């Protein structure tokens with residue numbers, strides 16, 4: 001068995017084809033087992049509609065999830081990603097790194 005805690009990165013990207021669009025991305029990388037729960041949060045509340053959840057694996061024991069959706073961030077809200085995984089004794093909430 002192997003278990004590896006996800007790395008979690010929360011960042012925004014504008015698709016170049018539509019710079020008015022902005023995606024909130026939670027990139028959950030390098031984890032095993034694959035079992036995982038990942039939410040984007042706005043002011044602590046899970047964003048229910050997350051348009052994209054792209055899961056891949058490299059080695060059989062390393063999974064990668066890009067969980068992302070369009071958003072329109074303002075300064076008045078806090079955006080984050082919450083991940084639960086067996087490696088994490090508590091849900092990990094990672095705030096949007098507005099510089100990343």
Ligand code: NA
Nearest residue numbers: 084085088091
């Ligand atoms: Na957890």
